[PDB]
Design a protein around this ligand. Structure first.
Ligand SMILES: O=P(O)(O)OCCNS(=O)(=O)c1ccc(OC(F)(F)F)cc1
Ligand SMILES: O=P(O)(O)OCCNS(=O)(=O)c1ccc(OC(F)(F)F)cc1
Ligand SMILES: *Cc1c(COP(=O)(O)O)cnc(C)c1O
Ligand SMILES: *Cc1c(COP(=O)(O)O)cnc(C)c1O
Ligand code: NA
Ligand code: NA
Lengths: 394, 258, 394, 258
């Protein structure tokens, strides 16, 4: 048995080889203990505040909403150390690893963002970090690869399968299934086998907690809706968590629509995929009619996770949260708009969330609404991508 | 289940262990795979462990990883695997056939439908690699409803609680892991709890290992990578591939005899 | 006459063509008025806090000082919106421009950092921004050029002279000397003609003010010394300002030594240059024996300003502040060290400051000292530069 | 100073204005520059305004910017400029010679030393482009100590205070800017305050502009870019360059006569 429920409705679970169950049980126990430990909370808060730069700002964007009845705020996770929200939870997981007496870290990464976050946290906390990355991503993300090595992390290319994220996810497990005694597997999103979905949410929930306090201070009321992009589900659940019990607050998750849902080239398994069992969990995923796991496409590499966190699939099933999709072009337009109107370059991942907020505003300009978009990261890394496109289009 | 019971009963009467080789269905091709399997049986295989090509075998090492890759390169699908299984059973009526599956391929078109298909083609057991005892309920229940033996893995660090669960839930045979990681005392406890006969797997690649397993009290041994390695090493020589497989299997099986 | 002293000892002044004096007088008057205006201070504080992300963290680096009696803190301006301290003052100057009723901004930039900062501030505050940049820097800083245009700024290449920063500085003045009526010249450092050295210091002094409050809270005392790199002098004077009257606090400015002072290829005019009159001020500068202005060399483009702020030359003359130099290799070593030991990628500019702190620690490891290094910016932009070098060296 | 006084006195007796061309010393080369200057004088130039090549002429437009560039390409230095000045004065004893300088070249080896050198070679005035009246003290004092006229610029937006300062501090002639920007009522006030005779500059490129300046009460006009443009347009034809310069200067000077 377990200390906490491994399921969110029908979604979730612990679908890993028997050999890895002790590692999951140990982790769950350490997490539960840590959550009730004032000393752990104090250390985590110290790192978040004095190292990562929390709390992050909640920026009111008056320019982009001119002429409408929409009031838009952006939770600035782009200002967090590392440039993305990932830093929050990797710091927490690194501390859990040390609590369990482990000095080694294992991580997987596609776009390389989680790899960089794992590397920085490991360097700061004196942990030996080894990262698995698909060969296709290694040659396509040279910058992030160099950042990882600069911070002392060992990067290991994965050529198996499609040589992408999912392929790296498997190789990481294989390694951990034979070294969990001294190494902790730092999963990069709110998915995978229990207790990861729960741990990642809890180590990202300060996003929503801060947002609530900030919006109450600035507007004297809660948002009509909070909007976040969904690749694996961590930044979204981090923003959503503290608002779940506030029934009046809408929760909107945005999956990547790629070239368009009807084209089949997208990354929206929650609303257009099919429930399956992979990566240690039961959840909606991109898969063939036969049950073979597929890849998710999006102009933004960060939203390439072929599945989605189980709590999101659950929140959707009960109608507490609504999920939609935004195409490559809609995200690109949002990216350009924020740059020119607010002087903020958003990550293409985050641009999907902003794009949906812009649609909510533009489709009903006279609708009075207070919206918060989780700006999960900065987009300096997406400059070339956006450039090549605008160029290839004249 | 019945086939395993009969097999172990017959082997026990001869005071010998079972040698069970593993191969990926359709590797390197449908036709060659069928020939490989017939060779393994003619060489002395007491039972078979057969994998269905899956996109993400996170429990297998490089050797098996490439086996699935070659199978996919041949366009092998789960549907074609079941057609192969039907034929294999039609040619060999008594040899126990166990499948090595990954959860999604079983859950895909319905767990019950999957085990019903296994029974229809003559499969005897199913081991779902990424389904621990903690999540096994729907799988073991569907298996039993279709006279399929649900195979459980007994890790080297398994505690009393796990041993008791594996002993009561498993059927056909108990998969005894020789180590942690991926492909590439406990025995006494299992017998005490009337668990299905134990077959040691992982790392078994030499005759002496088979003898040791039997001497330790196990009912037999399973060998996969050692078998698959012979396939990828003789891809350019199908005829030589079979010849070498026959030699390896006959040597491994001989080591199990009294 | 003027409202404030245009000189810091013998350094400073207003050496611009007569036609530009009214623009300088107007600016000085607007600045003086703004400084006594609670409404202006409130607006500036609002932007700094909710848009830029102030206050920035003061990070204690325990790993890099292990085995020594040095306690090192890093003022995290790298966490400021934009990735560098420049953002602070461009926001203030943009507000001054609006206070004077101007809707256009003129700026100059070499490495492109100031250009990006000017562009973001202008986009946020609805100002038409036009930026001058040397052609040699335009083709060498494609990324920053695209960022500027993404934010709606107009980038204008300068091919005159050596086609670098100094050349851009002149072209900007020429433009302003004929449009100051509706456009404000947003100078990028604590140099140039009065009142710029004073305005930039005042719009950057929150760095030092925050550092003081943070260090007192964390250590219960003032630093033994605060260390900052010096290109033009803005981040340094921003850190120094609030500590000037605290006689026990050492002020150390670090100029780029390039390939070595003796090689002549460096950017250290304050300690190795010669006093001259250029860019509207009397200050130490890189110049030939005949008085022709030269360029400053450094592995870090951001420290390429051929001169230095007049207040620094003054603080040096009276012995209140000490200035030193750090070579390309010392800065590179510091860059690599922070990455691996603290998980922070520092700007190569800032790495010069860190390098000197590391020298202070390493040369006298048993000396008890509390040091603060102003981490003026992040180094994600320097990844390729550092890479190519490590590569070209095997 | 004396040369300007004599010049303006002589021009006034003839009821005519002065035409003062500007050129960069050493552009496009030392020898050609000397020939250009002799041509300007033989063509009718009443006085000369000569620039010393500087690395950063932030008060000059493209035309003049390239003039300095060409001069530097020829290796022209301040020292060589003073040698040219000495020779020019040795050939023409009465024509007023004014230098257009940038502060650093004057401050470089000592402000006093610079003006002493100007007096030694026969220079009559010095206009430091980036030194406003507010910072002029050390420059105007050194100038006066060496009988050099310090030239001040009177902008089109100049207020009463500035007019009074320029009138009391200036000598030789008052530089009257026709507009803002760079190279490429007030008159009555200046005379009221006994300011040095005014010469209008910036944008003067046609005979009608010279006549207008004189008609407005100015003592003359200065033209630079128009002159320099003729140089860069005939770089490949030194002989044609001089011919065209003679034609332009003679036309401009004619427009100043009564
Ligand atoms: O000889 P090896 O090492 O290649 O081992 C043979 C592998 N083939 S198999 O069917 O036994 C086999 C059985 C169960 C497995 O996964 C689990 F343990 F997690 F459940 C993996 C492989
Ligand atoms: O005909 P143009 O427009 O080229 O004008 C001639 C330029 N040569 S000059 O010596 O008069 C001259 C004189 C002073 C200048 O700068 C200052 F006004 F700021 F002081 C610039 C040029
Ligand atoms: C990694 C990343 C994401 C996607 O992951 P989630 O777990 O879905 O949050 C989104 N935005 C940014 C900036 C990221 O770096
Ligand atoms: C621009 C810059 C500097 C140099 O300018 P100062 O005015 O000397 O501060 C230093 N560090 C960073 C990160 C910069 O962007
Ligand atoms: Na996904
Ligand atoms: Na400098």
């Amino acid at each position: 048995t377990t200390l906490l429920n491994p399921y969110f409705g029908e979604f979730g679970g612990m679908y890993v080889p028997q050999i890895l169950m002790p590692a999951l049980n140990q982790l769950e126990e350490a997490f539960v203990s840590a959550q009730k430990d004032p000393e752990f909370q104090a250390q985590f808060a110290d790192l978040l505040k004095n190292y990562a730069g929390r709390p992050t700002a909640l920026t009111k964007c008056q320019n982009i909403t001119a002429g409408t009845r929409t009031t838009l705020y952006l939770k600035r996770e782009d200002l967090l150390h590392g440039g993305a929200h990932k830093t929050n939870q990797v710091l927490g997981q690194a501390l859990l690893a040390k609590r369990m007496g482990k000095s080694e870290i294992i991580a997987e990464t596609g776009a390389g963002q989680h790899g960089v976050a794992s590397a920085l946290a490991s360097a700061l906390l004196g942990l030996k970090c080894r990262i698995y990355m698909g060969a296709k991503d290694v040659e396509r993300q040279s910058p992030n690869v160099f950042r990882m090595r600069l911070m002392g992390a060992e990067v290991i290319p994965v050529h198996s399968g499609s040589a992408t994220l999912k392929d790296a996810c498997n190789e990481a497990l294989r390694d951990w299934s034979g070294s969990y005694e001294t190494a902790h597997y730092m999963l990069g999103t709110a998915a995978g086998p229990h207790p990861y979905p729960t741990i990642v949410r809890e180590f990202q929930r300060m996003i929503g907690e801060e947002t609530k306090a900030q919006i109450l201070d600035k507007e004297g009321r809660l948002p009509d809706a909070v909007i976040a992009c969904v690749g694996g589900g961590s930044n979204a659940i981090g923003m959503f968590a503290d608002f779940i019990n506030d029934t009046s607050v809408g929760l909107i998750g945005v999956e990547p629509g790629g070239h368009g849902i009807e084209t089949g080239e997208h990354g929206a398994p929650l609303k257009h995929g099919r429930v399956g069992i992979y990566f240690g969990m039961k959840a909606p995923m991109m898969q063939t009619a036969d049950g073979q796991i597929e890849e998710s496409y999006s102009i933004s590499a960060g939203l390439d996770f072929p599945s989605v966190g189980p709590q999101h699939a659950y929140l959707n099933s009960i109608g507490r949260a609504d999920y939609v999709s935004i195409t490559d072009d809609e995200a690109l337009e949002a990216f350009k708009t924020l740059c020119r109107h607010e002087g903020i370059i958003p990550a293409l991942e985050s641009s999907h969330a902003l794009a949906h907020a812009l649609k909510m505003m533009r489709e009903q300009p006279e609708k009075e609404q207070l919206l918060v978009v989780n700006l999960s990261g900065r987009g300096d890394k997406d400059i070339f991508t956006v450039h090549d496109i605008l160029k290839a289009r004249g | 289940m019945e086939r395993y019971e009969n097999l172990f009963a017959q082997l026990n009467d001869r005071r010998e262990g079972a040698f069970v080789p593993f191969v990926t269905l359709g590797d390197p091709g449908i036709e060659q795979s069928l020939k490989i399997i017939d060779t393994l049986i003619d060489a002395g295989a007491d039972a078979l462990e057969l994998g269905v090509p899956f996109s993400d075998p996170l429990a297998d090492g490089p050797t098996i990883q490439n086996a699935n890759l070659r199978a996919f390169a041949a366009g092998v699908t789960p549907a074609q695997c079941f057609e192969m299984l039907a034929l294999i059973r039609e040619k060999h009526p008594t040899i126990p056939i166990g499948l090595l599956m990954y959860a999604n391929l079983v859950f895909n078109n319905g767990i019950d439908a999957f085990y019903a298909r296994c029974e229809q083609v003559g499969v005897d057991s199913v081991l779902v690699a990424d389904v621990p005892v903690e999540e096994s309920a729907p799988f073991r229940q569907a298996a039993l409803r279709h006279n399929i033996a649900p195979i459980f893995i007994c890790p080297p660090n398994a505690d009393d609680d796990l041993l008791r669960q594996v002993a009561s839930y498993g059927r056909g045979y108990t998969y005894l892991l020789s180590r942690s990681g991926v492909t590439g005392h406990l025995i006494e406890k299992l017998k005490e709890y009337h668990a299905a006969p134990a077959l040691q797997g992982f790392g078994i690649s030499s005759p002496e290992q088979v003898s040791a397993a039997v001497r330790a009290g196990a009912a037999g041994a399973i060998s996969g990578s050692a078998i698959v390695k012979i396939i990828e090493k003789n891809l350019a020589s199908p005829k030589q591939m079979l010849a070498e497989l026959r030699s390896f299997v006959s040597a491994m099986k001989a080591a199990s005899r009294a």
